[PDB]
Structure formats: structure tokens, C-alpha cells
Curated annotation (Swiss-Prot), chains A, B:
This is 3C-like proteinase nsp5. Inhibited by pyridone-containing alpha-ketoamides compounds 13a and 13b. In turn, alpha-ketoamide 13b (tert-butyl (1-((S)-1-(((S)-4-(benzylamino)-3,4-dioxo-1-((S)-2-oxopyrrolidin-3-yl)butan-2-yl)amino)-3-cyclopropyl-1-oxopropan-2-yl)-2-oxo-1,2-dihydropyridin-3-yl)carbamate) inhibits SARS-CoV-2 replication in human lung cells. Inhibited ex vivo by michael acceptor inhibitor N3. Inhibited ex vivo by compound 11a and 11b. It is found in: Host cytoplasm; Host Golgi apparatus; Host nucleus. The chain holds residues 3264 to 3565 of 7096 of the full protein. It catalyses: TSAVLQ-|-SGFRK-NH2 and SGVTFQ-|-GKFKK the two peptides corresponding to the two self-cleavage sites of the SARS 3C-like proteinase are the two most reactive peptide substrates. The enzyme exhibits a strong preference for substrates containing Gln at P1 position and Leu at P2 position. 3CL-PRO exists as monomer and homodimer. Only the homodimer shows catalytic activity. Interacts with host FBXO22; this interaction promotes the proteasomal degradation of nsp5. Residues 1-302 form the Peptidase C30 domain. Residues 1-302 are cytoplasmic. The active site is at residues 41, 145.
Amino acid sequence: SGFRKMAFPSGKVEGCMVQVTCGTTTLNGLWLDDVVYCPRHVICTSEDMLNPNYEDLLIRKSNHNFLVQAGNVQLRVIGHSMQNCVLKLKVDTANPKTPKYKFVRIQPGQTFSVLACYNGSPSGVYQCAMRPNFTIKGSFLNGSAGSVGFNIDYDCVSFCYMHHMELPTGVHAGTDLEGNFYGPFVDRQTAQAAGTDTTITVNVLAWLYAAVINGDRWFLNRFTTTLNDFNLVAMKYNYEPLTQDHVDILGPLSAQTGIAVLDMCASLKELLQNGMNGRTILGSALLEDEFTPFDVVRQCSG
Amino acid sequence: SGFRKMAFPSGKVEGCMVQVTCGTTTLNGLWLDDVVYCPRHVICTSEDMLNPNYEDLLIRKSNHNFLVQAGNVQLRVIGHSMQNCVLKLKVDTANPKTPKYKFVRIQPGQTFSVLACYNGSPSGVYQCAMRPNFTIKGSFLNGSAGSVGFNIDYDCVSFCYMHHMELPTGVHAGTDLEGNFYGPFVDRQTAQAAGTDTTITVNVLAWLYAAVINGDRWFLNRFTTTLNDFNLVAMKYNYEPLTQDHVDILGPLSAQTGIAVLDMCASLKELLQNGMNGRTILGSALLEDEFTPFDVVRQCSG
Ligand SMILES: CC(C)C[C@H](NC(=O)OCc1ccccc1)C(=O)N[C@H](C=O)C[C@@H]1CCNC1=O
Ligand SMILES: CC(C)C[C@H](NC(=O)OCc1ccccc1)C(=O)N[C@H](C=O)C[C@@H]1CCNC1=O
């Protein structure tokens, strides 16, 4: 028993992390087969990041402008092209540590692990969710661009995120591995703001089930509600509305605890109207929304 | 910027995890050079765990009673001995993925990463602290014994924890890698309880500094206090007393923010007397004590 913010083991990804230098700008790249993927703003100087023309900036470079280091080994760039907001650097050597992988775009509310890296060197791993406003609440310093987010599906690494930038509110924005931004953001140092965030309701319910599984039951009650009555009050507190797909997704957790989904919604509805009043749930005094139903099952059943 | 519960990258440890089977009991082992380390209760049947005599149980086994699997490969046990609460299985093959390592015993209040494993297979990584009562608030299911806790110091893995058992309160207990338990616990299925836990004060202060570094300043005030006045009120709320060593350890964070340690203690003293009143700090509505001063520096400066 117990419940922790748990990330995927990062070994398979650590072997793909490289350092990419172009000019006086160094950041991280992802080396899979004979391609290195990295954020395209590695080709910008400090002055270019204000209003860059990446097509111009790229035509003025040659393969030898790109320094790629995999630990102690230098990799020879033999070709380069731009795909949306990423750079694809073709290199002479295929990465022998290339895992089975795919590129997936995730949806708001889903979670993934982040391997934070500096100078091509893995520094830490943590778990986060893609917010409904397409930002992530990450932990990133200067030099972290090119760090990647991933899930592991059996023996297959699903890459879903490459880090690019921090917004003025201190939250983080990036792309999928095809270079398409999550959210309405661009890779230039302009003033862009995220839209308003909402709480991921299906994830809160999943976490309440994790609490029951671990012996926290004080918030339960005998009432029930309907999808429409719940959604009416959820709107008022900035909670995502709940659908029948969500209810179905919570099925396994309903079965294991014998508490129906709409039963648990009545508890949630009560917690929203009255608060926790100095009580905690799984060691927290706020409602946690960064665990999916699948995360809970994975941790509370295996 | 940002602040997350961040674990060390686990790749170097994933390569040392093996499956150890003896009888109908399977758990995890740690394979370094030509020794596999695992909890000694792998030699117990379901009936033996109530009052085991491990010296008797061990003399009745031979090397071939021990099935050791490193993925698909079987390892031949060529010798076995018991060191306190661990088993040392000598095998014919040295682990080629053996990192630079050492065995260290940590102190209450210090943090480490845990690689949770099942059947020799790494399942997840998370960060925790050794509590003042020598338990950890982990997340572990049946089959997790032999999972290890570690820190990474440059290129060197410091192993500090091997998991053995869950106590009735749902918290976890284990040994260092020499087989000596943390806390007054024994590896038999008796009724043992942890002593009362306290809050790790130096860690709370470190986290308040992380909050200031990230722009949360609402709890600051102009007062100051002395070590003795602070410690007087801290005792009443079950907080560890604060020493001059702690003050010195918080120096780098005091320097970076321009707020003296005893200045921040007055803020803490205020938060203990009055609470947060619906405000949060770094996304939490409780005071967090599982980040050391070193964790904060590592994440907020690099
Ligand atoms: C998209 C390009 C214009 C470059 C990008 N811009 C950007 O974040 O500007 C706003 C900003 C700048 C500096 C500090 C705090 C906020 C940029 O600096 N990326 C960094 C590259 O490693 C990563 C950033 C650095 C802080 N944490 C991160 O995640
Ligand atoms: C020290 C020996 C007697 C064996 C040990 N005893 C023990 O925890 O009994 C109390 C108990 C038992 C079952 C379930 C919940 C609580 C034991 O079962 N270890 C398990 C070996 O993988 C790991 C445990 C299992 C739950 N989570 C863990 O961390």
C-alpha cells in the first residue's frame, strides 16, 4: 500500500540523450537510429529569439555548424532538415541503445514522465499532467530545452513531449515529437499567455478511489447524484465536465471498491461545497488532479 | 523555474535488478560484480515468516535451491552466505553493467530515490525521505521486497536502502545494504509499531526558501526570532528542534534570497500558530518536509 507521485524508470531514455551545440547555444537532443531531434531555436543567437525567421536562419548554416556530443563521443552531422518546430539532424552513427519507440500526441488530462536534462546529461525524473490549457507545471531551468516527456508501454517508449520554453507565469510549453506545439504557442520570445486552467475532474475521482483503496474513507456518504446535477455544480468551481466515457473509464476502480462512480461524485460534490475542514486525503489538503485512472490502477493493483 | 518532487534518473540501477526465486517465494535482488544481494526472508515459506530461525533455514538449502534470473538469462549460484538481514548470493558471472557504487547508511531527514520493482522488473521511481521514526512513506505492493533506494553522486551510485516489509500503519521498513535495519524492526511477521513521527524542520525551512525563489512571498514578515524562542514553539507542534548546524546548512539559500535563517523561522513560527487560511505555498496547503536543503539547491540553481 501507499501512494506516491511515481514516474516511469528512465533508463531507456537516458541512452538517447545528447548535447547539441550550434554557435554559443547548447541544449539537449534526442538520438534515435541515425537522427537527432532537438528544438529548432538552437540555431538562434540571443538576438534572433525576438523575431526569428527560421527558414532564413537555417539556410545560412551547414552541417559543420552543429556540434553533437553523446557523452565523450562526437557525432558527425551528415544532413539537416526542419520539421515544424523541431530540427532533424541526420548523423553518421545509428544509436545502438535505440529502444522500441513511437511518437504519440497526448490529450489534456493525460500524464507522462519528464527526464530533465542539461548539456545532454540526465538530471532528474518527475511525473506531470498535460493541463487543459496545454501547458505543463514542470520544473525547468535555463538549458533544459530538448528534455523529453514519455510513457512506457510494456517494452515500448512512447515519446509525447519535447520541452521548448517557459511562459511568464512560470509554466512550461513544448511540442510533440513531430514539432507541433501543444497549445496556441510559438517559439519566439514574445508575450504569450496561457488560457485559464481548469481542474481535471476524472483524475480527482480516480484519486479519491486511490484514497479509499488505501483506507481514507471519511469523505464518503450515502447520497448519489446524476451526471447532470454533478456537472452543474462542477462548472461553478472550474472543474471539467464529466462524461459517460469518464464514468466507464472509472469502472475498474468502482468494481474494486464497490463504490459506484455517481456515488463518489456525490462525495466530490460535498467536498467542493464544504471543503476539507482541516482533514487530509492521502497526505494532501487539496484535491489532486494529476493521476489518471490508469495511474491509480497501475499503482494500487499493478 | 517550478518545483517538483524529483527523483534521480534510474538507468544505472535498472541494470542491476534481478529476480530471485527460492521455493515458491520470488522477490528482487541487486546484482553488483558477482554478488546478488536480496532480503533473507526469500528463504521462508508462508509458514516460516511467523517465527523464523534463519540460521536453521539457511543450512537446509543448497546453491541450487536459488533461482536467479537477469531478464532472460539464468545466473548460476556458486555460493551463499548471510550478512545480518540480507542474503549474499555469489554467482558465476560478474554484472557487466555494474556502476561505480558504494553502500551508505543515511540519517533521518535525508532523501533518496526508490526504484520499485516486481519480479526483477523495474516498475516506477519516486522520491522519499527517511522519517525521524526510521520508516519511509513508500508505495509498495506484494513482491516489492529487494527494491532499493539510492542517491547519485556525480557518477557514483550510493545505495542506502533495501525494502523488506510493510508495517500495520501502511508505512515501510527496510535495511541498509549491509543488512542492518533502519529503526527497531525485525524481519518476522510479528506486531511491531513505529514510534511517533515528527516533522523535519530544517526541510520545511528549505522548502519555504524554494517558495521564495519561485515567487511565493505572502508568508514573509519583518520579525525575527532566536533559536531558543523558535525551538520552544516548535516542540509544541511536534517539530524537530533546530540547531546551528541546520542554520549553517541553510546558508546558501539564505544568501541567494537575502532572507536570514532566523528571519524565515519567524515566518514559520507564524504559520504554525495561525495556519495558512486557505492560501497555498508551491501548490500545497500543508508544510512540506521531504526536500532537503541540497534538494532545493539542486533544483533551484542546478
Ligand atoms: C522559445 C525561445 C524564445 C527560447 C525560450 N524562451 C523563453 O522561455 O523565454 C521566457 C523565459 C526566458 C528565460 C527565463 C525564464 C523565461 C528559452 O529561453 N528556453 C530555454 C532553453 O533552454 C528554457 C527555459 C528557460 C527557463 N526555463 C525554461 O524552460
Ligand atoms: C518480513 C517478512 C515477514 C515478510 C513481509 N511482511 C510484511 O510486510 O507483513 C505485513 C504485511 C503483509 C502483507 C501485506 C501487508 C502487510 C512481507 O510480506 N513483505 C513483502 C515482500 O515482498 C512486501 C510487503 C507486502 C505489502 N507491501 C510490502 O512492502
